[PDB]
Design a protein around this ligand. Structure first.
Ligand SMILES: Nc1ncnc2c1ncn2[C@@H]1O[C@H](CSCC[C@H](N)C(=O)O)[C@@H](O)[C@H]1O
Ligand SMILES: Nc1ncnc2c1ncn2[C@@H]1O[C@H](CSCC[C@H](N)C(=O)O)[C@@H](O)[C@H]1O
Ligand SMILES: Nc1ncnc2c1ncn2[C@@H]1O[C@H](CSCC[C@H](N)C(=O)O)[C@@H](O)[C@H]1O
Ligand SMILES: Nc1ncnc2c1ncn2[C@@H]1O[C@H](CSCC[C@H](N)C(=O)O)[C@@H](O)[C@H]1O
Ligand SMILES: Cc1c(O)cc(O)nc1CC(=O)O
Ligand SMILES: Cc1c(O)cc(O)nc1CC(=O)O
Ligand SMILES: Cc1c(O)cc(O)nc1CC(=O)O
Ligand SMILES: Cc1c(O)cc(O)nc1CC(=O)O
Lengths: 263, 263, 261, 263
């Protein structure tokens, strides 16, 4: 399409924010898959539905008979896309733990990160495998101080820490939201330098507010259908726009590092 | 300022709104013109290009100009004018009145249309005391220089001037108010993200130009500008630094009319 | 080609600082050539021997019968590589201008920039063509304040301003040195992001000091033979290193903008 | 000092490369000091004299009766400034281990990083404390692949990993040379943006080559006495130049992260 006049072009990227989220959640899910080495489980409990928790739970359905997503926010059941996954709010979980025997997972995954699940609640399980997502990205004193990932690695015969970074680029956290935003912002800066570009728009907003303040998952999902970037230019930049975004998405590297505990 | 996903993370929306950035930029352009005019009074001022800075620049000319007329190829842009003292004419109505009338004979002509805008031929039909042409070019870009014809538009007026707007020490592709606002926001984000404890920084941007020229909805566009320029997720307070970074980037904008002497 | 151990490689760029200087001076000389449209001159006077002036004077020898380089520093005669170019210091030029008739150029080119040639000295000529190099690059208030390029365009039937920028990149001035330094620095940042790179070294120093403080052109020319960049990496980066540098050299765009009457 | 004419000022930074090196080696030595909690040792063995190793060995003399620096390069004995530090080449250490009993350290520190000490040689010791310097900085696939820091933490009752990063900035390694170079380069970017600056020169060269190819420590030490940055500007920037460098040096954060065997 054209801009203000036919002398300027407007190009909306084919890559949408949801395609960026998808690629990142998938890398996290594949990092977990690789660490699990094809092991099968009777009951998997995943803490934290947003943002990568939903796909990671879907990915566990193949080798896990029962997959339970647990979240402190009951409205996050709406972020699950597959009915095979069971959703439990934190109160219902804690209630069932005390007055029941149905909760005894062999796989526990903590994806809550900063200010999330307490090591105390994790200590109530005895799984074969414990995976804790490390929210820390590149160095930041403020984030390191509030982080307690090591304290959460208190159960499981096998323990692992899910780490996610961008090769050659700086990111403050390993969070899917942070990574998507950083991939978009870095692509923007390089796209603006392409010949004939007037300006580059990253189609961003505080998406996290839609999910946790407005409590509207449906609206949040609609907001992710937006082109990641919109560019105003004199010449065609469509090909270079997709290449810069794809290259930045490809920088994402996710892996589970085994936390050695001999006893 | 509010909590994010949990009480361990804060969300800070900047006090500075996108409209405050737009306002500061348009005002710098209007003051650059004011300074160049040296208090000279005019009977009829014609301003080509209502969007984005033309609206305020026309309002600023009302003091020393008896009649101020905004001319735009888009008739719906009459909605971007905020003062009823500014007369609005579409390009057809102007061209018609020029041929079959004598009411159009301005002593002050201002072309703010930039890229793919007013033709030097239409400018040649006037004989003002002062001609000011806004140069859309920012920092060097071959694609933009090729399409630019600012020098060809400086064909009339006893006194000629070129309105130039740049960001001191920073790169911008154009002098456009939209380009500058976007670049100020993006550069502020880059620096804000480096503050200690910041997780991620969101520039609240979108293709605002599309709302004005594709959707043809000025009202919606104006509402979209009321949004905070930046939203930050952090562990610690960044509210004061967030405003300081933005203010410093807004201050980098330098607008001036360079006299194009001729005899 | 190994570093501290055989597990790390050291790669010195094939492109030398002199190759970057050469490419930038040639772009400036070609910008002037295109503006002159093949016009022939009897006497060309070029103010400012360092850094592009030397090559620009050499490039004028084809269409100019006499080419004179003028400079406030007499030792800069050493930066001229062709004996066909005549060298005069600023004092000798001013003396001859006042008490003589041998100086009456039809082509005047001012390349001194910041704190250089006075509009008063330029006003003493009546050439067919005048070219003033604009030292300003991208926007900077401090540099704009001290700049007086417009005041120097006071003579010549045809006037032009030599402008040089880097497309899509920020540079404070249009000066050859600054452009070489900025090309090197920007290449280094992108090279550091290549996979397996540990660190990237721009082989820079205050080269200007060797020329104007130490007053040693020979040493300065030897200093330019160094590789522009040295990289420590686990994997091969030879070709990417040359591609990033070449792309940054290619961003340089020089042109003479005609100043009407 | 002036430049080409008196209209331009040349400013050489008061901060020398050696001062930036000093701040980085000292932070590493203080990170180790803090981790050791004042514990005293009979024999400390430090692998890798260059670059931070020499000062780290000097810092251990207070609480260690015997401090031995071990290096694969015999000429690196020249980088040690204090005669109290005993120097042994790699061959001499391995020979004495097999045909002797004088080598039985209670403190082992591996600072060799990439392509350095083999876990096999580390396995030959039985110290009270083992500290392995992690050479990895922020994420890079190539560097992570060649890194084997975890495999080197095979001995010691107490294990620690010395990590060094730049808060909010990207660095490929934790190496003293990499950090100094990155601090200088980042300071240049910001210094170049100061008003009136024409250009900024980082006074860098391949210093590592002087030490390992030319095998001249003396020359290397002389090369570090140079000002870190030289700036050409119209106005005074002395105070800002030192402030930008100091702020970048301050971003360096070194710490030993404990690895608990719990056995
Ligand atoms: N104690 C707790 N128990 C269960 N869920 C929690 C929790 N504390 C926070 N959460 C939930 O966990 C999520 C924290 S955000 C996690 C981001 C995720 N690691 C990613 O990279 O996408 C939110 O859905 C929040 O509501
Ligand atoms: N030939 C013409 N005559 C009158 N108005 C025109 C025109 N071509 C474009 N325009 C109008 O001029 C504007 C071009 S956008 C101008 C951007 C402006 N310089 C700024 O910095 O804000 C739009 O309002 C457009 O509709
Ligand atoms: N008044 C004057 N007359 C003649 N030469 C001068 C002068 N003032 C300065 N110079 C010389 O002009 C040069 C200024 S350096 C300018 C940089 C050059 N435009 C480039 O891009 O390479 C120096 O060689 C200096 O000795
Ligand atoms: N197997 C080995 N045994 C002992 N020293 C070694 C070694 N391999 C390399 N070295 C030495 O250890 C140093 C590796 S350089 C590591 C850089 C250091 N971590 C810093 O940040 O300053 C060099 O001096 C090298 O000669
Ligand atoms: C990673 C992360 C987290 O674990 C908790 C929180 O509140 N915010 C983030 C940032 C993000 O979601 O990207
Ligand atoms: C400057 C400018 C212009 O003159 C014409 C156009 O279509 N777009 C822009 C960019 C902008 O408005 O910022
Ligand atoms: C451009 C320029 C100049 O006009 C005068 C001076 O002294 N230094 C420079 C910088 C440079 O040589 O690049
Ligand atoms: C850290 C490091 C290392 O462990 C091995 C090597 O060859 N180079 C470096 C880089 C540096 O010294 O910064």
């Amino acid at each position: 399409n054209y801009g203000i006049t036919e002398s300027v072009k407007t190009t909306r990227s084919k890559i949408k924010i949801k395609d960026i989220v998808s690629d990142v959640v998938e890398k996290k899910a594949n990092a977990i898959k690789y660490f699990l080495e094809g092991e099968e489980f009777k009951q998997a409990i995943v803490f934290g539905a947003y943002l990568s928790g939903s796909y990671i739970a879907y990915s566990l359905l193949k080798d896990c008979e029962e997959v339970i997503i647990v979240d402190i926010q009951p409205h996050l059941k709406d972020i699950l896309f597959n009915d095979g996954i069971k959703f439990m709010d934190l109160n219902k979980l804690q209630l069932e733990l005390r007055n029941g025997t149905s909760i005894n997972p062999d796989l526990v995954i903590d994806l809550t990160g900063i200010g999330g699940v307490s090591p105390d609640l994790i200590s109530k399980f005895n799984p074969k495998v414990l995976i804790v997502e490390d929210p820390k990205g590149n160095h930041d004193k403020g984030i390191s101080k509030i982080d307690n990932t090591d304290k959460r690695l208190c159960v499981g015969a096998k323990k692992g820490v899910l780490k996610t970074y961008r090769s050659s680029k700086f990111s403050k956290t390993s969070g899917t939201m942070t990574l998507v935003v950083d991939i978009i912002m870095d692509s923007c800066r390089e796209i603006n330098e392409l010949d004939s570009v007037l300006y580059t728009i990253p189609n961003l907003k505080y998406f996290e507010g839609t999910v946790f303040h407005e409590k509207n998952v449906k609206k949040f999902l609609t907001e992710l259908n937006m082109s990641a970037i919109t560019v105003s230019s004199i010449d065609h930049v469509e090909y270079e726009l997709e290449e810069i975004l794809s290259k930045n998405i490809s920088r994402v590297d996710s892996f589970v590092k085994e936390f050695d505990k001999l006893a």
